Each structure stands twice: as C-alpha cells, then as structure tokens.
C-alpha cells in the first residue's frame, strides 16, 4: 500500500517507481518481507534472489549480486543493485566446477587476507547453486 518500489542498476533500469506489493531482499542476517509499513532500515545486501510480488498474475524472478536497501520514513523503499542479472542467461556447466575449484585452493593460501577471500568465493558460488 502506497509503496513506490524503486529498483535499478547502472546498465538498465528495472521495476521502477511502481506500486508493487512484496519484495524479497537477500541479506546477511537473512531475508525479510517488506509489508506495507515496514520499519526503515538501511541494510546492505548479500548475493541472492529477489522474487517481487505484484497483482499482475504471477511474480518475477531476478538475481542481485550486491545490493543496498534504503527504506525511508514514509512508505518508499529504494533498492539498488550492481548486477541485477536475469537468471536464464546463466550456464550451469561451467558454474559447478568453480565451487570444487576454490575449495581445492583453500590450503594454498599462505596469508590471512586471501583465506577469507576464498571463503567469500565459495559463498558466492554456493549462492547460485541453490538458486539454480
């Protein structure tokens, strides 16, 4: 109700300024539904889907690489995304071998900074394989 669902990207503007009902936000500390008087929170996002709910028959499916919420004082949530990619342009065959690749390179990290980074890489690669 009375909610301007803003959502975009640097390449192409997605669902923008339209009164859409419910948005899924993929976020560290989990996913939380936006229900029409949602409490304002400036939390940034983790990799995952956004399944956005409108009255137009059925829901759409997208995928955010690394986004940010700024839901304001009134009923206006603005979502951003670096890569709000569509799912169907993804190739499963090369995507699986990446997950076993980085775990095979975990113990080749002689420093402490990159050892978190390969833990980032498998988490981003685990994010897509449950999705697909």
């Amino acid at each position: 109700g009375q909610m301007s669902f803003t959502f975009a990207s640097p390449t192409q503007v997605f669902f923008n300024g339209a009164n859409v009902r419910q948005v899924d936000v993929p976020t560290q500390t989990g996913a939380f539904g936006i229900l029409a008087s949602h409490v304002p929170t400036l939390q940034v996002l983790r990799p995952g889907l956004v399944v956005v709910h409108a009255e137009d028959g059925t829901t759409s499916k997208y995928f955010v690489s690394s986004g940010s919420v700024t839901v304001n004082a009134d009923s206006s949530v603005q979502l951003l995304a670096e890569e709000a990619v569509t799912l169907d342009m993804l190739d499963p065959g090369v995507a699986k071998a990446n997950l076993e690749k980085a775990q095979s390179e975990l113990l080749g990290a002689a420093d402490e900074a990159s050892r978190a980074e390969i833990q980032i890489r498998i988490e981003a690669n685990e994010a897509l394989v449950k999705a697909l």
């Binding site: 539904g33 936006i34 229900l35 409490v39």
Partner: protein, 72 residues
Amino acid sequence: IDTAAKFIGAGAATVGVAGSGAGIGTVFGSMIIGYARNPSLKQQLFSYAILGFALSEAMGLFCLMVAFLILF
C-alpha cells in the same frame, strides 16, 4: 479423615493452572513485537495469536478439569 483427602486434591490440582497463565503472556507479548516490524496486522499476524491463546488455555482448563472430578 475422609474429608481431608478431598482438599489436598483440591489444593494441589489447582496449582497447575498457573503455568498456562504464564503462557498467554508470551503469545500476547509476541504479537506486540511482531506487529512492530510489518504492519500486516489484521491478517494472520493477529489471527495466529487467537490461534495460540485458545490452544494454551485449553491445556490449562484441562488441568483445572481434574479439580472438579477428583473433588467430586
């Protein structure tokens, strides 16, 4: 001596109605904090409270029902 066993079974059985009175403070406490996230309240947010409130009191009355059987 025959009257004295009536009242211990009256006094000790009525004790258990305290527990379910503690439970409906939780579910009505939790509806206050669930609403403060997502004002979709008149939908199944509030309706799950009256789901839960009737189900906990049904246990506490089930405790209190033996107080009228064992006394009589």
